[PDB]
Write a protein that binds this ligand. Structure first.
Ligand SMILES: CCOC(=O)c1csc(N2CCN(C3=Nc4ccccc4SC3)CC2)n1
Ligand SMILES: CCOC(=O)c1csc(N2CCN(C3=Nc4ccccc4SC3)CC2)n1
Lengths: 40, 236, 273, 255, 273, 59, 59, 57, 40, 40
């Protein structure tokens, strides 16, 4: 129950439960498959 | 008027509680969000990116050189480097992994340790990396080392080798601040055959080493880092 | 969810552990790519590492102090603690600062909490009960000049009155001018040859004038204000390397000269355990 | 017979071929794109010179020697004088751009050495003076020359200490930023595609640089016996999807 | 439910009262196996003997004390009570300890309650109003050094601020490293020849730094902290023999030498009533 | 603002009361339970196991 | 009696909060509204009317 | 809501920017009547300028 | 939920969301079209 | 009604109403029937 009118006044947000490290761990242009050779 | 009773704890301020508050700026409209590449949602997303370990810690002032593990041509049977696995201290401590682990009290999971070779292309080498699970001493010679988790690495076209320290543990969580009961083992590396340089070439070659966490990893019970402190408030 | 699957002996032409780090990727290698594993489940979600959780607890962001005393003959209230300000910022006490600067841009609502306690360091008959009045005073508004100016009327400016010993709590919407509060800024406010650098140019949020509403009693009373800040509804972009050296100034990246080696030197060899 | 290894990038009226690449990085996995209306604020129609600005400019070459500490360029600064890109830059009030960065360094199978090529969004530098000394404008706008981390401290300039990234963080952790290594034994180029990253939809191109490109030797250069002890490093950069807005009189900037 | 059924005379070949205790069983013999009984009902459920109930009331687990006084010239705040810690444990006051050690492994959430009262043993004009700040500080975190260190910023560490005379209450999830907090441990932290023994090796939970936030008044004020602990959501495994001798140390089973006979000697014969 | 009245007993701490409290460690995930033989639920379960009586108390 | 806990901020007066209050004049009937030309609803309505600029500020 | 619509070159007999202020009106002229604009949205309602808000603290 | 009986005791009103500047910006008797000549 | 998000913050648990002394009172491998001879 929100007792207040504005959105800033609500409690903390709830877990992204998004999670996708590939923008950080695999930003390569041509896709690399694990097990296939790195450099062909 | 509805009858109430107040409980113990009334009026306390707990920095970790999460409740509603009146907005000081009623009706204000925040700036629209635009798109920005790079959004982070979990610290677990970022500790999977690998970063360099200053393994060569033996210097006396911080230098680019403590990131370089040297290799000697023609040595046989001998040991390249050694370290315990207290990820919250020692070599690990300044790495991104080490640096985040320090915001939490407990960790569990597998670690990924990789070595990228930088010697001339016409050289060759075979190294053994060994993980020694808790309970034995840091290995003292390859024979001792080779009886635990190990990978023979053959230096080739493919420049890096990724060793995993699989989670070996009785207790399902360990402390990030070094603790005995909770200790994780040792990591050592030895010549399997030996580094060989081509003609017209000389000196030391170096390995770069990285650390990142496997998708396996768990961190819990947040706390304050020993890695930052201060004596007076800063000003502009 | 499985944390590890079962995997047995391998003798392949398909080697997942050989990679080329020069590419910039961190290949997702697992224990089961290089040893024989057994199934195990995660039993865990990664709840407490969510950025909302990481930045979502109250941190002390500021400690100031004001006193209640006879202003008779004081030529400069501001200077006597008859009242004090706070050029709002979050990077002055380092604990929360290192946490925020793990990101480049950050967007969130703030919830503040303000604790005020009184001290009577010299002989008083009693402890008086003072009401504090912290005024949010934004850029371009009348700066209070005395502790009882027309400014304190605060007819258009949000102000909260609470008692010393108690706590005040309110939350302010996100009020950055851009889409996200900037943590770093490699720019200037204009192409001037001598203008400042960094973030102190950007994010301007205005003061906070605190004062005691009470007139003076016979003794003097020191009131020390602690402001706590909790981020709620957090959004963070572009992770960066954590802060290694100590901080010197609110808004610049500068570190102190002849600082000490931040990497612990081995007591022994590279070979040491 | 496609290898990760050979590549061709054609952009405008200019083409680059590498026969020894190591894939390419696209920052944060996003490719440069123009500014959508839903994100727009300024009401002005923007100008998109296209092929006259989105081509490859090769900056002047550097020389890697055994004593090198590393070099740093800022964008869009490094290009402030390249052809029509630069003119547009000084003539509009606001502009926006992504880039393709191609760093080149070839040697032989007897050399060793490894450079880190990294892009840092919002790289705010530190004053070597400490305290709250600022870093004057000119110092953070080196132009095509870039900053040479092995040059001496100057007054009003930034600190040039490599183990600290010019800002109080450790060299070892720069790997959290989009980056690629050039390891003579593997690699001979590094290519990074940079999408536009800012907290505003479009900004000024002269008062704010939005990325620093940094090339840092990490494993020292080691040449074969009686080889000349140095290699040149060349940086070629191409603006991509550039848009300029708010045209007028032509900015005058310090120094 | 019947507590006793009706049963009459018996002349059988089936004797439920003869058993062999050497087997380790306690055969479930009832009044009706050996006398003639009448029906009666239980009227009772055994509600208040549930382990949740048994361990579920608040028990005092710790009394400490800190003082508010001028720290000017104090070389060791910790040593002056300017602040104090508490190496969290539950086995220091014996009442709750004997109750828990009826079990080998125990798992529960904790709810704490903290009462703080002030004393002014020597001449004061008044009673000041102090705010306490108890900081949960876990293993591997900055130990407060002075009563006003950066540590107290507690940007990532849960802390509660309440007033002396009041009570603070919060509950902490179960945070043992294993599946159940261990009550006994016949092991070491490693195979060392001189390492300690017992449980002090295992369960580590970290301190709790308490301090007064107030600066000093003219008199001195003693604040004494009492921590109460209530187990909620209890789970207990493997019952053991109750503690007979007195305790000597937090975490070892050791009893004092030349202790006294714990079994009451008869005043009379074996035959005595 | 809803009108309330507080009753006698407000603010007291009764060691035997059972109410909710804020968690100090929001979002923390406890270690999984594994199976352990021997769980006790009621003290009534254990007082049915017989134990020896020092009947010969005369020492 | 329903159990409550009061949070930080209890008793504060924030000049910008918006809550209900008891009416001091229970049951009073205000004067009827009549029609008046000119009602303003937003300050945004009025800043669109142009007014003169003292551009020649040099006096 | 659009804050500005897209508008291009103009060569007309219909001039929205010439008016007669003597009339007492403020003619509703927009950026797009005199320069070439691109679409943009308002993202804003004017909530905090309502007179209830202005006099309500 | 109003807890009180009288209307004066309720909280602040809610946004007009009325907005019509023409009574102030265009109170002319004969309608002026933008683009058509001001004075004919 | 839980007012709080985390499970640790809820009140005491509710009676096992489990109760099975046989793991403690009759852990014998071959089942003993009351009335039948203990040792056959
Ligand atoms: C690491 C460097 O980053 C910073 O220092 C940083 C990043 S966002 C930030 N804010 C933005 C939010 N805020 C504000 N509080 C107020 C408090 C009281 C009254 C009005 C306001 S209106 C904005 C505090 C400062 N500061
Ligand atoms: C008979 C011998 O057994 C013991 O002494 C025993 C068994 S479980 C136990 N805990 C576990 C739970 N806890 C904890 N409190 C805290 C209090 C405040 C802030 C953080 C915590 S985090 C764990 C108290 C000690 N101690």
């Amino acid at each position: 129950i929100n007792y207040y009118k504005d959105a800033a006044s609500t409690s903390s947000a709830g877990q992204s439960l998004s999670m996708d490290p590939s923008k950080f761990t695999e930003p390569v242009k041509d896709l690399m498959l694990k097990g296939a050779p790195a450099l062909n | 008027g509805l009858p109430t009773t107040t409980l113990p704890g009334s009026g306390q301020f707990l920095t970790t509680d999460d409740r509603q508050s009146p907005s000081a700026l009623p009706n204000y409209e925040p700036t629209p969000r635009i798109h920005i590449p790079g959004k982070v949602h979990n610290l677990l997303e970022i500790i999977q990116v690998d970063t360099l370990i200053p393994m060569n810690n033996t210097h006396t002032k911080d230098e680019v050189n403590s990131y370089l593990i040297p290799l000697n041509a023609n040595r046989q049977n001998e040991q390249v480097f050694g370290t315990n696995l207290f990820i919250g201290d020692g070599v690990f401590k300044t790495t991104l992994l080490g640096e985040i682990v320090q915001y939490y009290t407990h960790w569990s999971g597998s670690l990924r340790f990789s070595l990228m070779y930088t010697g001339p292309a016409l050289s060759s080498a075979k190294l053994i990396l060994a993980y020694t699970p808790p309970g034995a001493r840091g290995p003292q010679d390859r024979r001792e080392a080779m009886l635990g988790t190990h990978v023979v690495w053959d230096i080739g076209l493919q420049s890096t080798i990724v060793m995993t320290i699989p989670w070996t543990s009785g207790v399902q969580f360990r402390y990030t601040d070094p603790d005995t009961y909770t200790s994780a083992g040792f990591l050592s590396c030895w010549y399997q055959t030996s580094l060989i340089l081509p003609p017209e070439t000389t000196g030391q070659v170096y390995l770069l080493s990285f650390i990142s966490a496997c998708p396996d990893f768990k961190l819990r019970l947040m706390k304050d880092t020993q890695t930052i402190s201060q004596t007076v408030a800063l000003t502009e | 969810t499985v944390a590890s699957i079962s995997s047995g002996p391998k003798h392949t032409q398909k080697v997942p552990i050989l990679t080329a780090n020069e590419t910039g990727a961190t290949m997702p290698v697992l224990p089961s790519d290089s040893i024989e594993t057994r199934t195990t489940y995660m039993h865990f979600n990664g709840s407490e590492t969510d950025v909302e959780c990481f930045l979502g607890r109250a941190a002390c962001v500021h400690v100031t102090e004001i006193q209640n005393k006879d202003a008779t003959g004081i030529d400069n209230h501001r200077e006597a603690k008859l009242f004090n300000d706070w050029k709002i910022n979050l990077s002055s006490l380092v604990q929360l600062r290192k946490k925020l600067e793990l990101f480049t841009y950050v967007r969130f609502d703030s919830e503040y909490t303000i604790l005020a306690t009184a001290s009577q360091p010299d002989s008083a008959n009693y402890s008086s009960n003072l009401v504090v009045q912290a005024m949010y005073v934004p850029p371009g508004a009348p700066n209070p000049k005395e502790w009882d100016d027309y400014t304190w009327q605060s007819a258009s400016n949000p102000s909260v009155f609470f008692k010393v010993g108690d706590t005040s709590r309110f939350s302010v919407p996100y009020v950055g001018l851009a889409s996200a509060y900037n943590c770093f800024y490699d720019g200037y406010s204009h192409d001037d040859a001598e203008t400042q650098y960094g973030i102190t140019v950007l994010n301007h949020m205005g003061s906070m004038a605190f004062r005691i509403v009470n007139e003076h009693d016979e003794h003097k009373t020191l009131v020390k204000i602690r402001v706590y800040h909790r981020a709620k509804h957090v959004e963070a972009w572009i992770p960066r390397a954590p802060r290694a050296l100590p901080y010197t100034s609110i808004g610049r990246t500068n570190y102190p000269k002849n600082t000490e080696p931040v990497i612990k030197k081995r007591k022994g060899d590279i070979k040491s355990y | 017979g496609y290898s990760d290894r050979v590549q061709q990038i054609t952009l405008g009226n200019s083409t680059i071929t590498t026969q020894e690449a190591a894939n390419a990085v696209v920052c944060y996995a996003e490719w440069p794109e123009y500014l959508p209306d839903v994100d727009a604020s300024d009401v002005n129609k923007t100008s998109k010179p296209d092929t006259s600005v989105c081509r490859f400019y090769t900056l002047d070459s550097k020389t890697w020697t055994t004593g090198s500490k590393g070099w740093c360029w800022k964008l869009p600064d490094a290009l402030k004088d390249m052809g029509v890109f630069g003119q547009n830059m000084f003539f509009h009030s606001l502009g926006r751009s992504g880039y393709t960065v191609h760093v080149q360094c070839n040697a032989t199978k007897f050399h060793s050495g490894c450079l880190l090529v990294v892009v840092i969004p919002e790289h705010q530098l530190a004053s070597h003076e400490g305290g709250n000394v600022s870093v004057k404008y000119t110092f953070t706008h080196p132009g095509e020359r870039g900053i040479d981390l092995s040059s001496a401290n100057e007054v009003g300039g930034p600190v040039k200490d490599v183990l600290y990234n010019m800002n109080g963080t450790l060299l070892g952790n720069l790997l959290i930023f989009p980056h690629q290594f050039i390891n003579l034994r593997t690699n001979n180029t590094a290519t990074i595609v940079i999408p536009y990253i800012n907290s505003v939809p479009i900004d000024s191109m002269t008062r704010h640089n939005n990325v620093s490109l940094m090339v840092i030797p990490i494993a020292p250069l080691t040449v074969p016996t009686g080889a000349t002890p140095s290699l040149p490093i060349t940086v070629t950069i191409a603006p991509m999807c550039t848009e300029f807005s708010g045209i007028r009189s032509k900015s005058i900037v310090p120094q």
